[PDB]
Amino acid sequence: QLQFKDAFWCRDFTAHTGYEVLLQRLLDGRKMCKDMEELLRQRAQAEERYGKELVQIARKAGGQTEINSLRASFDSLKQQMENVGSSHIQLALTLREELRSLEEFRERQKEQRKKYEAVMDRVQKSKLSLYKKAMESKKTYEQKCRDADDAEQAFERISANGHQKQVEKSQNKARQCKDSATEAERVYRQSIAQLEKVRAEWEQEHRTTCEAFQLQEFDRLTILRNALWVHSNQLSMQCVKDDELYEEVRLTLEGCSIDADIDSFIQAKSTGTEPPAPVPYQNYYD
Amino acid sequence: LQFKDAFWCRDFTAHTGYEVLLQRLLDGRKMCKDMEELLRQRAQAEERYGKELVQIARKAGGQTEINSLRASFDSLKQQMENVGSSHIQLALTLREELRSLEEFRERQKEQRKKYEAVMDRVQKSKLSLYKKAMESKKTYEQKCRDADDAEQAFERISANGHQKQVEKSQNKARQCKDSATEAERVYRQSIAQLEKVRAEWEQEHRTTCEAFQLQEFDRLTILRNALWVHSNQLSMQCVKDDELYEEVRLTLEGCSIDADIDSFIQAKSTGTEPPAPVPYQNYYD
């Protein structure tokens, strides 16, 4: 039980603080989406540099002087290092795609937000404009009523024993002043009528904008929460990929027998199984 | 299946068996260096990677967010630094393994040089006395040929030659036979001196082979173990990071979209009633 429409009004007729607070929340939401975008961007750059560095270490690493099992195990470690480095380079492209998804979502909400801003700014400007005119008409109407009352009181004063020419002067003046009070009343009634029509338009627009702004925040909170859940899974998935790649190094080490490598080197590089015969004395005549 | 019984040479002057084994130790030393450089470069990569993760976490924003989504974002920032700090610790772990192999490699070089000096000394003496024995054989056989030419010259003229000439050639043949006998003793002694050194070389060669085989058994064991430990430490880093990333998902489970919307409304609400319309006010009422 909480809605933007029912909870962002203002008793002050000339105040639009409710709309301003909601519009500020959207601006704060836009900044939050940018901060999520920048974190993915920098993280992708960290993954790319890290992935490329792992690949370079694997390619340029040595081990050519080793043979048999230990050579295969070392070549297996180099091979899996390149696989991890390439996988982290692939992760950088994945994060940059998530960055592009939020990037176009942020601009899509800005386009729809600007449309509501133009409507509200127009109707609020007109509401305050006609309210100012109605108060100016109200002041004139109340001044004309005072003029009409004082003009009639002046006529009744001199109508008692005043001269006929003087009495007729105040009577025609009071009639002219009383008509001006009627005309000022019609203009004041018209100003109130014009203000009422715009006020009902503003209240309908404000309720419409509140429902729309709440939908924009519900969508933004949902997609940002989803972005964090997907980002955490993609990073956790990278740990599982790497652990499986490092498992291939351990699988190669399982077939690494120290005694087998020693026997393999002996059989391949053996020179002789018999020591040289001693040099004996040779008689020249026998 | 032993180094001693399988690295001899029928050629008396050949020590190829020892040279092949020493070449294998040099190839093993280079392999240990290559394992050292792989750990060094990997440690440098982990440190650079870890430090960058920390910097991204510290400098990341999100200050405009509130309630659950802010806490979830702060959880990712906090765990990113935890992962980055853990990778810096991994670099120090790999550098200690690098230092462990480095001191094993230098301890084997010191012991190898000691066996190299012993074998080089006895092999140099073995070839030296063999050369002297062959030089003595050449002189002994040359003195025998001189004795043969001295006896044939006497026997040629001993038939009908003059008494003075026959007695002259007889004394020459007697002196040539004496030189062959004296040269024979020098040749016999050279063979005797060479034989004692040869038996010493055979005992040294067998001892050095067992030592070189023990050095290879130690090197293969520590290098195979180093690969096994290195793979486990990298796999341990994947498990640590997954546990740190698990804290981000645990924070997201308590992230309710409706709760954050309600929290903003309760905190920033301005009014529940729209403003009353402006009515016509009669000056006389």
Residue numbers in the entry:
A (entry chain B): 4 to 289
B (entry chain A): 5 to 289
Quote the passages of the study that discuss this structure, keeping the authors' original sentences.
We determined the previously unknown structure of the isolated F-BAR domain of PSTPIP1. To better understand the molecular basis of the physiological function of PSTPIP1 in the immune system, and its role in autoinflammatory diseases, we elucidated the 3D structure of the F-BAR domain (residues 1–289) using X-ray crystallography. Initially, we solved the structure of the G258A mutant, and subsequently that of the wild type protein. The two structures were almost identical. After superimposition, the root mean square deviation (rmsd) between all the equivalent Cα atoms was 0.275 Ǻ, which was similar to the estimated errors of the coordinates of the structures (0.23–0.24 Ǻ). The asymmetric unit of the crystal contains two molecules of PSTPIP1 that form the characteristic elongated crescent-shape of F-BAR dimers. The concave side of the F-BAR dimer is overall electropositive and contains two clusters of basic residues in each protomer, one in the core region, and the other near the tip of the wing. On the other hand, the central area of the convex surface has strong electronegative character due to the presence of multiple acidic residues. Large acidic surfaces are observed in the F-BAR domains of other proteins, such as Cdc15, growth arrest-specific 7 (GAS7), and formin-binding protein 17 (FBP17), but are absent in several F-BAR domains. The residues of PSTPIP1 critical for binding to PEST phosphatases (see above) are located in this electronegative area, supporting the notion that the acidic convex area is important for PSTPIP1 function. Finally, the conformation of the PSTPIP1 residues involved in LYP binding is very similar in the free and bound structures.
PSTPIP1 is an adaptor protein expressed in most immune cell lineages. It presents two structural domains in its sequence, an N-terminal Fer/CIP4 homology-Bin/Amphiphysin/Rvs (F-BAR) domain and a C-terminal SH3 domain, connected by a linker region. The F-BAR domain of PSTPIP1 binds to the PEST subfamily of protein tyrosine phosphatases (PTPs): PTPN12, also known as PTP-PEST, PTPN18, and the lymphoid phosphatase (LYP), encoded by the gene PTPN22. Positively charged residues on the concave surface of F-BAR domains interact with the polar heads of the phospholipids in the cellular membrane.
